[PDB]
Amino acid sequence: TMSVLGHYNNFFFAAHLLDIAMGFKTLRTILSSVTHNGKQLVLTVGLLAVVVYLYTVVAFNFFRKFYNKSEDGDTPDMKCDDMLTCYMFHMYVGVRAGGGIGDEIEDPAGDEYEIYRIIFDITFFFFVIVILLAIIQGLIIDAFG
């Protein structure tokens, strides 16, 4: 079917490269390390989503004046004024930021939060991109063994 649709568009021939994985058994030694647990990986990403949602609701309820990703000044945008918007911002930026979330938001120098938001950022870092990516990378290493 994809080979036939390749005549209507000469780009469905890219889906035929998936036959190097779902077809011949030359890549099984590598792909089995991923498909061995399978359920563990999706449970891990679900737990990650739940933890990020907890951090998102905490931020939505206690940190308003920080999510101020304005460009050129005086253009407030990508704030936490919406639960879904803040959750998407977290799951899309803070996870892939490589240094937690304290590097994509304002400097926590404001009073009454200088310590609470430092704790928030460092806990997000240590719990999301340190011990929740280590689990994903260990589920792949244990499968080889």
């Binding site: 009073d111 200088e114 310590i115």
Partner: peptide
Amino acid sequence: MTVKDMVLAFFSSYWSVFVT
């Protein structure tokens, strides 16, 4: 005002160990 007073309040409890 708790970024600096926190460590002082944390150390103010060990005075009962410093007296003994």
